[PDB]
Every structure is written in structure tokens, then in C-alpha cells.
Design a protein around this nucleic acid. Structure first.
Ligand SMILES: [Zn+2]
Lengths: 54, 1076, 348, 144
RNA sequence: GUAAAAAA
């Protein structure tokens, strides 16, 4: 499920020449989620349990 | 499960397979109402949404979703809190809306009819089918679908039900004054007889059904609007059934209502078959809606507006994606719709106009469809077409220069048929064929797998070869990479439909998924037929600049990618205009490549100009072409080419005074700019006759009919005229004849003499021809001379290298001609050539340690240098002391070898410096070439021949002195012994190759054959034993058949089947494909 | 400073006869140059010889001219009127050119030292051996294992790697390639005795990273060893730019069967292009020119994805890049399995 | 917006404020950006106070029941803020709502450069043409 | 560097 989600966000970045700061940090977050899938899953489930203001 | 065309197809099939649907005997009517749920996302209430999501899922997930919808939206200096309505840009918004819309579907249908349409929970219905026929016919609502927020309802009304419903509607809203027709809706795209003027009862039934559904929906949540709604009624008076779904106008006509006995069979009409009685009971006509024609036109408008500043290739790619998505979506509806095809023609014209304006600000008369539609592999833009473009045979004309001369072909003149650019509408399979073919291909693949596991074998590509680009989804999708994640990927179509709210970049392929559906189109046949319709690759490359770049074959041509100046150079903080120019450098590449066909008078009619320092005529202002041509012919390259050609021809004349009985050869130097003077000409080379010669009539160089006139003459000229021919004018024979006749019969030209010959050179196409008088010797001498010149002139080498660097082309190892059989024969001319071998230099040997480990301990090597014209063998011995303490050892072995070869060339005097070098390894070219930058008159090339200087190392004395070497050394040996005095150098080199390949293939049998008698003694200053001529040819034959037998037993090929040239090729070191 | 020859900067090769010192005061003191528009055979040929292989090329030089031009308008009238000055090239000062040379030296030294596959005779043991534990070492190539984790069902994979830190096995030498073919034959025989087919691949898809060119041998079972060209065909048809400049799949096996022999791969692809190639035979296979650096997978992810797709694997095991270690038990086990087929052993 | 705006009350919540917060959180559930202007505090303040009130009432329920023994052992279950106390390698999601951390004795180099550039940027007021006119006034004065 | 006598 997580790999499908990250592939969707990365293909939202697929054809991009110039990247701004939020674009580069979202690419970095995606590759961190690729490298540590378990930690990302715990963080995601913690956010889904706890966060109500965004 | 399905793509939106398959959804439309299934909706047509469901309508056709309803009970008695076309029966209007008892007054029953059918209604399709399509409408849109107005302001649903806007009117979602977040507390109620939290309650409904709490129903279907965990409360933490529901609370996350609604809290996520309650956010602050910002745009520049504006901000507000969204506290009412959903945000469609959240990732889960498509899911949340499909659930909310399901609740709205329950409101529209009622729970009981929704349960009947959905079927029982354990065995749910298929799409548009029911459990049984009474459940189908219980209720007036027969078919229902919601696509996000568009809904379609198909109702079937008896006369009594229709009367009750119209009675209630007119009780609520009474209006007799006949404006329900003047305010109703109908399809103005179909024919008038496919429609008609409306009727009171059908109109009242339509507005009454709309009224009933609007009464079902509560306005605070959502409503449906009459301006959003289209209604169609099929009755006894209206035998037609109209609806739009996802882009398709669909008109259904029953076969029991059609007024013709027979039907014109169309590739564009769906034949709706009854699923019980199995005959075609209805026809469905499809068109594209005008809204979608507008959407495609707006997509091309968006391309043009954002693409005033980008490349021709990106413009072409965007056009290609738009067109292929349009045609692969609509298929039959596209070729049915007449306004769509006109829009495609106009949009294609606009795209080509964009490329034309970006090339030159003034509109031309005719670019070739070659330059627009040639595939990207041949340097074209690779555009597809949805129009019909005539390809003229004036574009299809092409010529070829061989040693005989010039051959002209007019391809297409086999037939009078109009060659057209092909149409992807003809290359894409219709949707109905796709659905039937999908059924049959998946059944076929399942069976083929069944026999594969029955006979317990492997599936082969020959099994899964015919059933390859077929199906929905594709067998290709069975062979894509990820399949587990694909099994877990759900909701992707709805996800894309909401991806328009997360991304600015619109997807023309929004309707299909390559990961799930697979690629639903293929253009290999299209591209081959485009090449054939353009007239073949030879015709295309006649249009281009392929002749001037000096490449052997168009296969193996590679184009370097040139786009990364964004990441590369934006650190310079460029201006908007600056980075637009950097974004359009790929346009100079395209313009240079297609240059011979653009600046033509027929293309750009007008007042031609002349490029400074050249003889190029520029037709209109093409600034990137002008810049590139200045970068090519900079440093007076036109006049310097003329000077180098004249110098080479005068060198040939200087060495052939005695051959042609020429008293002296004069080199006129008064005119430095006559080369690119084009109004008239003077002469370049002067010939003074020692004896009175009889010259021929004026004729071309390659004409074989020499009519020697009786007029005696003494004074001759040779006049070299350069040219840069466009595609309209690159017939160098006609050019040289016409300019020769004019410059002789025109009195402002002052030739120094009344006899002469004019040689003209077309630089843009690498051509040449001559016209004038000939005393004997000129034809053969100038033939050999000009062949060697245009294969050997260094100014022309500079020109070819500049064109290669300006196109950024690379080539495979079908590269510049290495050593082969022909230049193997051509070694033995007067030029000083020299072989360089370095494979024996850096030698390492595997030594076993006391631990059992392996050490790559280096030993000495020897740079081998071989003059074959004199049989000289220089050896440069390099030591382990040199190899000590270095990293990247093989690389610096090559670089050292280049360094000491350059040192030896430096030590050599001018008279003893070689003209040509040939390296055995092809890796030495870069280090040797850059270290011989200082000696650029040396021509350096590589060898495709694998000569056995390994065996030359394997000779006893040389290997012994290499082993006994302590310091670096430099020694010289002789390899021809006395064969220079006995036989020819050709035969001596052949014998040397024979003995060295014999030593390559074995050592004991080789030395036994070389020394069959102990009376034969090898003396001191010779390397090989002294034999007679008959003994030497006997040893030659023995080593020849020894090598042939070893090759036969190694490759399992019979010896007697090889020809003499083939046996020579094995003796040389070449590789030959098997004759069997 | 410290040698820095033409091998380290090809523009540091003799006199620059294409340049000309600027007559102005700043051209005297800063050290700008210009174009030597009176030049001959010698000068032009020397210039092209020195300027082949430059990054970017003539496109980058025109880009530098535009980036200098402050009055530049992207307009055809402007380009035509300023055509001469725009066409005029720009030549770097010798100080900046030495800066380029020392920069590539520092980058190349860092890459060469950090590369886990190079073998040099300079640094002392145990650092003389590479990080990859050598099993069989020919005269100029050798063989180690694929790093952990491997794709399940394809365990025991090897890599054939030359001593010379190339970027392409088109850059590799003739004898390097010959003993690479011998390694391929030996591994093919080993895996056929194992009962499995073998495929080989070279990932030259990122030549700007200057990785050590290695040929990975992956063993696969029999039926998917038959169907492997379909998987690689589909992946290379789907994983790159749709409107590609070249053919998406070039069939070196088909060219070899037609007539190129062994030399189909080395005579079919230009060495200056980024590519991926897979061998199923010993003389052929099929390959792809990587034209979209963003759309192509990063690193060896392309081949890992394809191999996992055949051998259905955990995607974590797929996108976990391999990491090399020096002491490795399964390398010892693969050596004690390998020592039968070793032609380097029968040579020694 | 969440800390430094001068309309943000960082004093302790009154009883009327707590009653309003609970009443609105019952009315418009999990809609904190909507609730916060009516209460008068920020959305993060309202959310953190609401979960603190719920945890306080949970602890008073546990104390009233007396499930645990004496308050001198290690058998107490951790609080919600204890579970939400960060993992080793966990990022704060709302450091803009957390209060400011005081300056250390020794600043780091990024902070010295940050202070220097702050001073220069605050002092600067002119554009490029105004600066060249001042420079050329001085140069013309000296030349004259 | 193209458009006025231990801080390109
Ligand atoms: Zn390395």
C-alpha cells in the first residue's frame, strides 16, 4: 500500500525540470520512505491517530 | 474494470438487452435522462460527512478525513478557512466523494430499487443486468449509472404510468402555451431526420421525469438543473434514442425501426446484438461531442501559448501525445465526426506554422513533409498526422555519387498514385474489434498455458508471439514489472479524475492506465510506412545534411541529448530571454541537420542574400542557421578549402610533369577571394605544354566518348569552383557545365589561355564534377587525384568534424573506416605508414603466494613499432621500475605509450617523420591523437585487423632480451631480412603475416616447419632462417594449411569450402560469417 | 601543479593556436582571449583534436555565449542582427582551465579511492585488495559476487569486473572483453550444471556518476529463462521517453544472427551514450539507450525491478540497493563451489 | 500566525473558555480551524487544551476508582502526552506552536552570520540607481 | 562585461 502511494507521488514529480524547495523536500521524504518503510508506516499511523489540525 | 469507451459500449448493450425495449405497440416509452449533480462538493457538510464516514470506517480515520478538510486555503495575500464543502485536492477525496455520491444514489433510486439494481449481497449483479426478468421489469427505472457526479437514468414507462406521471407534473406546473418545446433540448449534431420537430407528449414526459428526479433531491445537499440536463424520449413517434457519455454522442436506432432493406456497412457503427436471440437488433451511431472537439482545440491552444519559447521537438512531442490520445480514445467516433477532422487539420497546420515561425519569421511556400514527419532517428521531428499531406516527387527525387559518377532516381515514378503521409486513424484498431479481440485473446492465452502445463514444458515466445499486442488488459501487462502492487492498486480511474485538482499538468491519457490496461496503441507499422511514403531513407537523407557529415551508414547514428542547461547553467542567474534561448539550442541542431532543404528559393521565395566569407546563398533570414554556418565556415574556411584543394592538385601536377609531358605548372595567386566570388571567375592552375597536344571536345569528366579535335594547343588551365548546393540545385555536373560555358563565353572572365578544364566541388552534398577539354591523362589522373583528395583533404576533414560537432552526432563502430582489406592493399603506396602496437607493453602474471593468494605481478613490456614499407621494427622496452607506484595502470599504460611514441616522433627528423599511423588497439586513439596534436599532419587511424605482435613478442630473441631488460631500452630490427632485395614488399608482407600468424597459432610446429633441417642456420643479424624461394613458398604453404586446419578444427568448418580471399581473411585476422 | 597533463585536461596540450590575447588593458591584466581568425590546417586540426570529448559541446559553448549576453532577446530579429557576435565562441582563460583540471582531479581521485572495485598496486595490504572479495582473477579482469540483498530465486549471482575503472564495456579493451567472454562462458556452464539459465546485464545508464563498469550475471530458472526477452522488451518499451530519439529496443542478438558475430554489442552501440544492455546468449541480447534521466530508474533499480517481476519478490528486497563487504561467508561458499570451472585456475 | 501574532493569548485557560471549548467541540466535531475563532484561541491551542482536559478527566476517573495502589510505584500507565512523547528519531509536527528556546552562551556560526546579515539588511534602504548616484556625487566632487 | 574623456 505504501509503495503504491509513494509511486503515485513520485510520478506526480515525473516530468519536472525546475524544482522548488517544497518539491525537493517532497522528493527527499519519498526516498526516505523508500529507505525506511517501517518507520514511515509508524509515523503515518501516529499521524492518523493523533493529528487533527493541519 | 473498463475504460470509458467500454463503459459506453456496455451501456449500449444493456439498453439493447432490456426486455421489449424497442416495442412501442402498447404506447410504452423509453426515457434517458443525463444530468449533473449541481454543487455537491461545495455543499458537503463536514459534521454529516463525519457521521457517514464513521458509519463505514474506523472513527480515527473518519476524524482524520474531516479535520483534513477543515483547513486554511491561501492564495498570495488572501486566506480563509474552509469550513463547508470538501477539498477535492486531498489524496483520498475521490474515495470520499464516491461514498457520498453513493448515498446520493440511494436518495435518487430509493433503497428498494437500489437493492434490486445492485443485486443480492452474496451474488451481486453484473453491470446493467438483473437477477431475473420480473425483477428487471418491476420498476420504471431500468438502468442507472453515476460517473463521479454525472448520472444517467434509463426509464421505461407504460402508457398508464406515463399518463399518471405527466398528470402529476402538469398538476404541479401547468403550462399550455407551447414553450416546453421552445425551451427543450435536442441534439443539433445529428441529422434533422435522425431527429425531428418535437411532440407535446414526449416533451411533457421528458420535463416530467426531470421534475420527478428534482423532487427526489433535497436542495440543501444538491439539485439537478435543466440547463445541465439532457433528456431523450423513444416512443412510437420518435424511433431514436440519444445520449452522451464521457465524450461520445450516441444515437441508437432499432433495426425494427430502420426504413431501409439493406445497410451500408460502416467501420464506425456499433451493431447491438441481443444476448438471447443472438442477432444484431439495433444500430448505435457515435460522434464526438462539440465540447470535446473544443477540448482538443484548447489543448493545442495551450501547447502553442506555452510553447512559443520551447523546442521544435517538445512541440512535436506534445502534438503527438495530444493526437494519439485523441484518436486512441475516440476511434470510430473520431472518423465519424466531421468537425473533429477539420479541427485536426487546422491544428496540425498551426503546429507546423509554429515550427516555421520559430525557424524564420516570414512564411514560406513549401516545407517538405519529410522535414516535418521524418522519424526522430533520422533527425526529423517525428510528428504523427491526422490529415492528408501530399508528398511531391520533387521532394522524392534523389541522387547518388559513386566512382562511375552520378545516378538520379525519382522514387514514386513507379506509379501515378498520390503518396500521402499515413494516418493513425488507419493504424488504430476500432473499439468493437478491440473488445471482441480481447475476449478471444484472453481465452487463447489461458488455453495455451493449459497445454504448456499439460506437456510440462516452457512457454515460448513463439507461443506467446501472435497474441502479443492484444486484449484489455494486455498480455503485455502480464509481462510488465510490478504485479503484486498492481493486485493491490484500487480506484485508479477515479483517482485520475480527481488528479486534476492536485496537479496543474493535464493528462490527455486520463482515461487509461499503462500499469493496468497497458499500452493500447502501437506505431511501428506507422513509422515504417512513413519512411516508405517519404520515399525511403536514401531520399530522406538526400533532403538532410547526411552527405556532408561523411558517415557510412544511417544505422549506428546516435544523437546526443542536449537539454540540461537548466540544471547546468541557471546558477548564472539568467534573464527570462536568456533561458529561453538556452531552451532553444536544440533548434540549432535541427536547423543545421535539415539545412539543405530549408534555404531553397522554392521554399523561401525572395531576394536572396550572400553569406560573408562563403558562397552560400541565403533565402530569407534564418538566424540560427546563419550562426551555425558562421561557426562552421569561420576563419575563412571557404577560401582555405579552395586553397588546400588547389595546393593538393598542384602537388599532383608537380609530381606528374614527367607523366603528362608538362613543361611546368603555374600557381596563380592574384585572386584570394575568387573562391567565393560567384559573379564570374578567373583560373587557378596553369599548364604549359612542352609539346603541342590535341585535346578532346568539351565534355564531362566521366564521359567515355572522347572526340579528340585536330586543333593543337599549348596552354591550359584548371579552375576549381566551390559550391554549397541546396536541395533544388546540387547537380554538380550541370552546374559545372553551365558555369564553364558561361565563364568561357563571357568576356569579363579572363582565363589566361584558350584551353582548360573546370572542376567544381559541392560542399553541402560532398559532390564533384568537371567539364572542359582533355588531352590524354586528365581523366584517369584527376579521377584518382580527386578521389584521394575528398577522402583525404585536411580542410575537408576540418569541415566534416565541425559539422559533426555542430550536430552532436556520434557513431557506433561502423565508424570512420579502420584497417580492412582495401586499405590493407593500400598500405604500400609512397606514403610513410607505421603500425603502433601496445598490447604487449603492460604485462602482468599471476603468481601464487605461500597463502595461496594470487598476485598480479607486472613484468616488462615493449611498445612495438612496424614500418611495413621498409620492414623496420622499432622496440621500446618498458620496465617494472616504470610500472611501480602507479594507479589506473592500463589507462596510464596507454598514456605512456602515447607519450614515448610522441617522444620518438619528436626525435625523428622532418624527412623521416611518418605520414600515417595505424594503431592496433582502438583505445590508443585519444591519447595518441592528443599527444600528436603537435604533429597534426600525421594522420592517425585504427586497425580492425588483429595482427599477431603477440607472436612477435613470442619470438625467442626479442622475448629473451625483454626478460633480460633492466632499464628502459630503444632498439631497431629488420623483419624483411633480404626479401626487400629478392621479392616485392607485398609478397614479403604476406609472408610475414603468414609466419607471424603461424607463431600465433602454435610454437612447436611453427618452429619445426621453419627449421625442418638442422643444416639451415639462422645467422646473427637476421631473425628468420635463410631459405630459397621454393623452400620459402613450401614453408608458406605448410603454415597456410596448418593455420587453416587449426581454424577448421576450432570452428568446425570444412577447409575446402573457403575461397582464396576468405583464407586471406583468416590469415589476416578477420572474422567471417559461416557460409552454411 | 602536480603533473596535470593533457590526460587530465585535453586542453592542456601544447599551444592554443585558436586563441589570441586581447589588446585592451583588461585583456592584458585579467587574461581574456579571443578567436584567432587567421588559422591554418595545423591550428584547426589541433583545435578539434583538443575539443572532442568536451562536456556539453558546441551547444554548451553557444549557451555560454548567450549567458554572457546581457542584452539578449529571444527573438528572431535580435538573433539575425546579432548573429556574428552570438556565433563568436568563448574561450576560457588558462587559470579557469587549470581550475577545471584540478576540479576533475579532485573528483576523480575521490571517486577512484571510494570505488569498491578498483585494484591498484600502490596502497599497502590489506587495502590493496578491493572491497569486493576477489575469487578468480584473470590477467586484467576478475569476478566477485552480487551484494546483499539478492533477489530470491536468483541467489548466487556474480559480477564480472575489469581491473580498469571504466564507465563502459564499450570503453573496455579487446583482451578485457575476450576474458569477459571467457568468464561468461564459464558462468554459463556452471549454471547449466546447476540446472538454471543465466542472463547478464550492464547498467551503463548513468555515465555521469562514473561507476565501475561491471557485468552482472544473474541466474534464473528454466521457463522464465526462456521468457526473459519478453520481460526485458516490455520494461525497455515502457520505462523511458515515449517519443524517443532512437529505437527503444536495439536487438544485438538479431544483428549477430544476421552478420556481426560476437561484435554485435561492441559494434552496435556508440560508447558516448547512456545505455542498458542484457545478454541472453554469448553473442547477443538486446539493449536500450537511456534518454530520460528522470523517467529511468536510479541506479540498478531497473534491472532489480525486472528480475523481481520475473521472480516475484518482495518489493523491499527489490528496492534495497546492494552494499559490498570485504569478508563474506557466502563469497567463500561460492568460491568453494566455483573452483571446478575456473579457467584462471587451469591457466595457473 | 500560530505564536508571534500579538492577539494570541498564552495565559492559562479560564473556566468559561474551557466550557466554551468543550461545548463547541461537541457541536462541530474535529473542526478545529472552525472552532478556534469562536473560542478565541488558536486551533493548536484549542486542540491541545481539549486533549489535556480529556486526559485530566481520565486521570481523575482512575484516581476515583483507585485501580492503582500507592503513588510511589512504577505501575502507572503512561499518559497520552507520554505516548506522544517523541520516539528517538521523531520530528515535532508543530514547532511553530511550541514556545521559543533561549539563546545559549555560545552561539553557532549560522547564528552569528544570521545576526550580521539581519543588521545589514535592516539598515539597507536604497536601490542600485540611488547607490550609484551617491557614489557618482562623491566621485564628481573629488574630480572637481 | 553586452546595453555613459584567521572579509563578466
Ligand atoms: Zn573501480
Amino acid at each position: 500500500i505504501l509503495i503504491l502511494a509513494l509511486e503515485r507521488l513520485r510520478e506526480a514529480y515525473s516530468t519536472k525540470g525546475r524544482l522548488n524547495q517544497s518539491q525537493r523536500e517532497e522528493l527527499a521524504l519519498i526516498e526516505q520512505a523508500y529507505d525506511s518503510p517501517g518507520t514511515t508506516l509508524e509515523r503515518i499511523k501516529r499521524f492518523l491517530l493523533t493529528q487533527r489540525a493541519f | 474494470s473498463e475504460v470509458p469507451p467500454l463503459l459506453v459500449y456496455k451501456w449500449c448493450q444493456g439498453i439493447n438487452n432490456l426486455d421489449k425495449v424497442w416495442d412501442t405497440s402498447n404506447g410504452e416509452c423509453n426515457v434517458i435522462i443525463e444530468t449533473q449533480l449541481s454543487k455537491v462538493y461545495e455543499k458537503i457538510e463536514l459534521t454529516l460527512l463525519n457521521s457517514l464516514l464513521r458509519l463505514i470506517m474506523d472513527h480515527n480515520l473518519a476524524d482524520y478525513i474531516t479535520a483534513k478538510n477543515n483547513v486554511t486555503l491561501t492564495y498570495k495575500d488572501m486566506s480563509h478557512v474552509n469550513s463547508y464543502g470538501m477539498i477535492r485536492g486531498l489524496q483520498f477525496s475521490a474515495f470520499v466523494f464516491q461514498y457520498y455520491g453513493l448515498i446520493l444514489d440511494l436518495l435518487i433510486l430509493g433503497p428498494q430499487r437500489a437493492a434490486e439494481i445492485a443485486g443480492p449481497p452474496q451474488s451481486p449483479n453484473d453491470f446493467l443486468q438483473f437477477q431475473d426478468r420480473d425483477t428487471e421489469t418491476r420498476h420504471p427505472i431500468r438502468l442507472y449509472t453515476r460517473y463521479i457526479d454525472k448520472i444517467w437514468v434509463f426509464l421505461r414507462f407504460t402508457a398508464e404510468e406515463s399518463r399518471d406521471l405527466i398528470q402529476r407534473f402538469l398538476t404541479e406546473q401547468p403550462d399550455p402555451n407551447f414553450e416546453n418545446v421552445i425551451g427543450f433540448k435536442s441534439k443539433k449534431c445529428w441529422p434533422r431526420d435522425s431527429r425531428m420537430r418535437l411532440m407535446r407528449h414526449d416533451v411533457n414526459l421528458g420535463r416530467a421525469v426531470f421534475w420527478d428526479l428534482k423532487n427526489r433531491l433535497p436542495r440543501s445537499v444538491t439539485t439537478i438543473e435543466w440547463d445541465d440536463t439532457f433528456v431523450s424520449v423513444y416512443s412510437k413517434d420518435n424511433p431514436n434514442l440519444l445520449f452522451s457519455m464521457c465524450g461520445f454522442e450516441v444515437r441508437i436506432l432499432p433495426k425494427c425501426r430502420n426504413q431501409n432493406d439493406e445497410f451500408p456497412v460502416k467501420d464506425s457503427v456499433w451493431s447491438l446484438v441481443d444476448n438471447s436471440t443472438k442477432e444484431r437488433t439495433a444500430h448505435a451511431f457515435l460522434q464526438v461531442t462539440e465540447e470535446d472537439i473544443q477540448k482538443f482545440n484548447n489543448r493545442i491552444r495551450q501547447i502553442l501559448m506555452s510553447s512559443g519559447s520551447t523546442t521544435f521537438t517538445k512541440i512535436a512531442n506534445k502534438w503527438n501525445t495530444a493526437l494519439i490520445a485523441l484518436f486512441t480514445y475516440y476511434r470510430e467516433a473520431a472518423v465519424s465526426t466531421v468537425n473533429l477532422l477539420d479541427t485536426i487539420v487546422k491544428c496540425e497546420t498551426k503546429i507546423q506554422t509554429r515550427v516555421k515561425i520559430g525557424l524564420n519569421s516570414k512564411m514560406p511556400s513549401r516545407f517538405p513533409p519529410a522535414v516535418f514527419y521524418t522519424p526522430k532517428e533520422l533527425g526529423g521531428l517525428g510528428m504523427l498526422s491526422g490529415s492528408h499531406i501530399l508528398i511531391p516527387a520533387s521532394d522524392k527525387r534523389w541522387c547518388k555519387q559513386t566512382d562511375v559518377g552520378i545516378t538520379h532516381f525519382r522514387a514514386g515514378m513507379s506509379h501515378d498514385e498520390e503518396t500521402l503521409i499515413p494516418n493513425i486513424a488507419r493504424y488504430i484498431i476500432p473499439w468493437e474489434a478491440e473488445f471482441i479481440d480481447s475476449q478471444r485473446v484472453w481465452t487463447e492465452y489461458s488455453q495455451k498455458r493449459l497445454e504448456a502445463q499439460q506437456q510440462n514444458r516452457r512457454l515460448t515466445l513463439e507461443d506467446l508471439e501472435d497474441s502479443w499486442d492484444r486484449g484489455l488488459p494486455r498480455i503485455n501487462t502480464l509481462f510488465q514489472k510490478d504485479r503484486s502492487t498492481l493486485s493491490f492498486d484500487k480506484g485508479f480511474r477515479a483517482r485520475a479524475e480527481f488528479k486534476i485538482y492536485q496537479l496543474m499538468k493535464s493528462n490527455p491519457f486520463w482515461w487509461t492506465n499503462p500499469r493496468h490496461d497497458g499500452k493500447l496503441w502501437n506505431l511501428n507499422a506507422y513509422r515504417t510506412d512513413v519512411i516508405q511514403a517519404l520515399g525511403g531513407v536514401e531520399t530522406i537523407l538526400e533532403h538532410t545534411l547526411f552527405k556532408a557529415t561523411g558517415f557510412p551508414s544511417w544505422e549506428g547514428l546516435f544523437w546526443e541529448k542536449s537539454s540540461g542547461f537548466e540544471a547546468s547553467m541557471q546558477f548564472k542567474k539568467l534573464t527570462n530571454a536568456q533561458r529561453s534561448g538556452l531552451n532553444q539550442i536544440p533548434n540549432r541542431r535541427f536547423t543545421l541537420w535539415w539545412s539543405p532543404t530549408i534555404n531553397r528559393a522554392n521554399v523561401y521565395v525572395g531576394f536572396q542574400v550572400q553569406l560573408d566569407l562563403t558562397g552560400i546563398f541565403l533565402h530569407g533570414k534564418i538566424p540560427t542557421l546563419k550562426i551555425s554556418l558562421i561557426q562552421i565556415f569561420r576563419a575563412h574556411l571557404w577560401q582555405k578549402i579552395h586553397e588546400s584543394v588547389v595546393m593538393d592538385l598542384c602537388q599532383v601536377f608537380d609530381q606528374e610533369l614527367e607523366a603528362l609531358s608538362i613543361e611546368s605548372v603555374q600557381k596563380e595567386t592574384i585572386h584570394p577571394r575568387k573562391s567565393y566570388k560567384m559573379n564570374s571567375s578567373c583560373a587557378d592552375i596553369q599548364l604549359f605544354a612542352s609539346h603541342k597536344w590535341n585535346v578532346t571536345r568539351p565534355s564531362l569528366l566521366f564521359d567515355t566518348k572522347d572526340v579528340i579535335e585536330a586543333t593543337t594547343t599549348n596552354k591550359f588551365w584548371i579552375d576549381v569552383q566551390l559550391r554549397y548546393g541546396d536541395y533544388d540545385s546540387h547537380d554538380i555536373e550541370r552546374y559545372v557545365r553551365a558555369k564553364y560555358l558561361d565563364y568561357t563565353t563571357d568576356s569579363m572572365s579572363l582565363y589566361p589561355s584558350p584551353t582548360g578544364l573546370m572542376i567544381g566541388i559541392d560542399l553541402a552534398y560532398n559532390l564533384y564534377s568537371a567539364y572542359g577539354q582533355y588531352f590524354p591523362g586528365l581523366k584517369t589522373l584527376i579521377q584518382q587525384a580527386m578521389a584521394k583528395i575528398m577522402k583525404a583533404n585536411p580542410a575537408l576533414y576540418v569541415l566534416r568534424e565541425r559539422i559533426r560537432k555542430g550536430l552532436q552526432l556520434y557513431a557506433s563502430e561502423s565508424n570512420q573506416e579502420f584497417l580492412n582489406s582495401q586499405n590493407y592493399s593500400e598500405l604500400f603506396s609512397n606514403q610513410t605508414q607505421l603500425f603502433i602496437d601496445d598490447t604487449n607493453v603492460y604485462r602482468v602474471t599471476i603468481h601464487k603466494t605461500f597463502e595461496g593468494n594470487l598476485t598480479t605481478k607486472p613484468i616488462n613490456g615493449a611498445i612495438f613499432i612496424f614500418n611495413p614499407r621498409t620492414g623496420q621494427l622499432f622496440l621500446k622496452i618498458i620496465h617494472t621500475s616504470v610500472w611501480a607506484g602507479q594507479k589506473r595502470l592500463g589507462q596510464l599504460a596507454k598514456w605512456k605509450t602515447a607519450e614515448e611514441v610522441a617522444a620518438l616522433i619528436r626525435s625523428l627528423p622532418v624527412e623521416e617523420q611518418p605520414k600515417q599511423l595505424i594503431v592496433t588497439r582502438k583505445g590508443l586513439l585519444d591519447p595518441l591523437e592528443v599527444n600528436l596534436v603537435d604533429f597534426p599532419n600525421i594522420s592517425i587511424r585504427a586497425s580492425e585487423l588483429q595482427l599477431p605482435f603477440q607472436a612477435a613478442m613470442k619470438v625467442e630473441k626479442l622475448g629473451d632480451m625483454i626478460l633480460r631488460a633492466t632499464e628502459p631500452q630503444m632498439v631497431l630490427f629488420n623483419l624483411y631480412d633480404d626479401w626487400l632485395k629478392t621479392i616485392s614488399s607485398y609478397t614479403a608482407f604476406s609472408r610475414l603475416i603468414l609466419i607471424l600468424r603461424a607463431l600465433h597459432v602454435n610454437q612447436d610446429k611453427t618452429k619445426l616447419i621453419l627449421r625442418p633441417d638442422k643444416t639451415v642456420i639462422t645467422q646473427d643479424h637476421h631473425i628468420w632462417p635463410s631459405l630459397t624461394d621454393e623452400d620459402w613458398i613450401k614453408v608458406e604453404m605448410q603454415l597456410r594449411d596448418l593455420i587453416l586446419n587449426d581454424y577448421g578444427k576450432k570452428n568446425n568448418v570444412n577447409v575446402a569450402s573457403l575461397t582464396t580471399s576468405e583464407v586471406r581473411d583468416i590469415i589476416l585476422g578477420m572474422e567471417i560469417s559461416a557460409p552454411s | 601543479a602536480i603533473v596535470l597533463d593533457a590526460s587530465y585536461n585535453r586542453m592542456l596540450a601544447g599551444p592554443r593556436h585558436e586563441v589570441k590575447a586581447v589588446t585592451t588593458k583588461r585583456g592584458r591584466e585579467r587574461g581574456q582571449v579571443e578567436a584567432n581568425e587567421d588559422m591554418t590546417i595545423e591550428d584547426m586540426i589541433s583545435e578539434e583534436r583538443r575539443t572532442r570529448g568536451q562536456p556539453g559541446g558546441e551547444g554548451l559553448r553557444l549557451a555560454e555565449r548567450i549567458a554572457k549576453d546581457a542584452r539578449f532577446e529571444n527573438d528572431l530579429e535580435y538573433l539575425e542582427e546579432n548573429a556574428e557576435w552570438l556565433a563568436k565562441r568563448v574561450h576560457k582563460t588558462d587559470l579557469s582551465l587549470k581550475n577545471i583540471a584540478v576540479n576533475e582531479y579532485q573528483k576523480l581521485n575521490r571517486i577512484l579511492e571510494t570505488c569498491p572495485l578498483c585494484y591498484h598496486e600502490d596502497r599497502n595490504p590489506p587495502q590493496n585488495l578491493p572491497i569486493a572479495p576477489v575469487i578468480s582473477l584473470g590477467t586484467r579482469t576478475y569476478l566477485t559476487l552480487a551484494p546483499e540483498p539478492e533477489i530470491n530465486g536468483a541467489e548466487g549471482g556474480a559480477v564480472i569486473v575489469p581491473l580498469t575503472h571504466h564507465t563502459n564495456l564499450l570503453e573496455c579493451d579487446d583482451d578485457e572483453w575476450e576474458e569477459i567472454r571467457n568468464f561468461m562462458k564459464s558462468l554459463t556452464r556452471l549454471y547449466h550444471d546447476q540446472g538454471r539459465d543465466v542472463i547478464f546485464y550492464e547498467n551503463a545508464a548513468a555515465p555521469k556518476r562514473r561507476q565501475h563498469a561491471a557485468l552482472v550475471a544473474v541466474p534464473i530458472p528454466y521457463e522464465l529463462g526462456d521468457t526473459a526477452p519478453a520481460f526485458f522488451r516490455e520494461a525497455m518499451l515502457s520505462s523511458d521517453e515515449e517519443w524517443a530519439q532512437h529505437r527503444k529496443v536495439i536487438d544485438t542478438g538479431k544483428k549477430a544472427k544476421e552478420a556481426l558475430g560476437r561484435m554485435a554489442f561492441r559494434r552496435s552501440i556508440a560508447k558516448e551514450m547512456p545505455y542498458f544492455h542484457v545478454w541472453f546468449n554469448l553473442d547477443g541480447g538486446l539493449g536500450h539507450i537511456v534518454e530520460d534521466e528522470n523517467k529511468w530508474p536510479k541506479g540498478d533499480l531497473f534491472a532489480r525491478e525486472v528480475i523481481g517481476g520475473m521472480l516475484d519478490a518482495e518489493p523491499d528486497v527489490i528496492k534495497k540497493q546492494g552494499r559490498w563487504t570485504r569478508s563474506d561467508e557466502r563469497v567463500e561458499g561460492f568460491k568453494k563451489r566455483w573452483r571446478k570451472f575456473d579457467w584462471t585456475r587451469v591457466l595457473t | 500566525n500560530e505564536w508571534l501574532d500579538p492577539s494570541i493569548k498564552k495565559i492559562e485557560w479560564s473556566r468559561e473558555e474551557d466550557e466554551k471549548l468543550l461545548h463547541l467541540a461537541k457541536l462541530m466535531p474535529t473542526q478545529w480551524r472552525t472552532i478556534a475563532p469562536i473560542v478565541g484561541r488558536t486551533a493548536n491551542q484549542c486542540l491541545e487544551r481539549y486533549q489535556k482536559l480529556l486526559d485530566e478527566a481520565e486521570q481523575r476517573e482512575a484516581s476515583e476508582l483507585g485501580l492503582t495502589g500507592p503513588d510511589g510505584g512504577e505501575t502507572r500507565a503512561p499518559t497520552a502526552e507520554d505516548v506522544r512523547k517523541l520516539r528517538p528519531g521523531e520530528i515535532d509536527p508543530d514547532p511553530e506552536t511550541k514556545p521559543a528556546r533561549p539563546d545559549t552562551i555560545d552561539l553557532d556560526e549560522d547564528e552569528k552570520e544570521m545576526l550580521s546579515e539581519a543588521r545589514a539588511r535592516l539598515a539597507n534602504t536604497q536601490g542600485k540607481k540611488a547607490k550609484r548616484k551617491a557614489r557618482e556625487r562623491q566621485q564628481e566632487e573629488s574630480r572637481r
